[PDB]
Design a binder for this molecule. Structure first.
Ligand code: 6Y3
Ligand code: 6Y3
Lengths: 129, 124
């Protein structure tokens, strides 16, 4: 009903990006982890990878994390839901360069976090402000 | 035609936050600083203050940064555009971050765009 909770591992769909492996956390500054922007709701996540990035992301753009094997399937539904064939084709981009390297880092870290207890991976990966 | 460029100080309005001082910058991973989310244009900023946060923000949610003084004014016209939700005290660790990032923003407004691109951009 509240689909996610702090510590839940999620994929984030961010514009301009492939699906990115994440963890739900509380905002260091706001102290919440979900809010109403006034009734399609956000969750605050951390992005995995050696970049310590964080964001508030819409429920509509999160998907609970099951493993790297989800990935290909996730991108199809992103395409299954695009209007024209100018948005459904806009996803055929190769993940290369620094972006792939960060992404791989993120995916490896997410599986590292997936095999953990929630209260474990909470205390190991949550950024300390 | 493009309302900002790499090195421009702007205020950004992120929901649930008070207006934040930022610099327009190139996304290190995407290698762009502006894009169409497709007819709502975004720019990529980095939020001043010691936590190096960066985001794509909408053009509708950015104002150019002349100095701390506009804060009041900016907020009042935001609250007139919903409403009572922005009537909260900026306190604690958020006020500390905010005040820190404002300070860095005023400092970069004296420099040339070259000066501030060197000093203030993030090494990624
Ligand atoms: Se979602 C996906 C599946 C297969 C191949 C590529 C993608 C993808 O999102 N690629 C991509 C590459 C680069 C950038 N900047 C965004 C997206
Ligand atoms: Se924008 C503003 C002007 C005057 C006083 C306060 C504000 C403000 O936004 N405060 C605020 C406090 C806490 C949070 N989470 C958001 C905003």
């Amino acid at each position: 009903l509240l689909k996610y909770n702090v510590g839940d591992l999620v994929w984030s769909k961010v514009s301009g990006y492939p699906w990115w492996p994440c963890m739900v956390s509380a905002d260091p500054l706001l102290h919440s982890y979900t809010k109403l922007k006034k009734s399609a709701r956000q969750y605050h996540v951390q992005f995995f990878g050696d970049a310590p990035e964080r964001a508030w992301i819409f429920e509509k753009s999160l998907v609970a994390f099951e493993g790297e094997g989800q990935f290909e399937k996730l991108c199809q539904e992103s395409a299954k839901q695009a209007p024209t064939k100018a948005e459904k084709i806009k996803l055929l981009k190769p993940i290369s360069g620094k972006l792939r390297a960060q992404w791989e880092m993120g995916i490896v870290q997410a599986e590292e976090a997936a095999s953990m207890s929630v209260e474990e991976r909470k205390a190991k990966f949550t950024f300390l402000y």
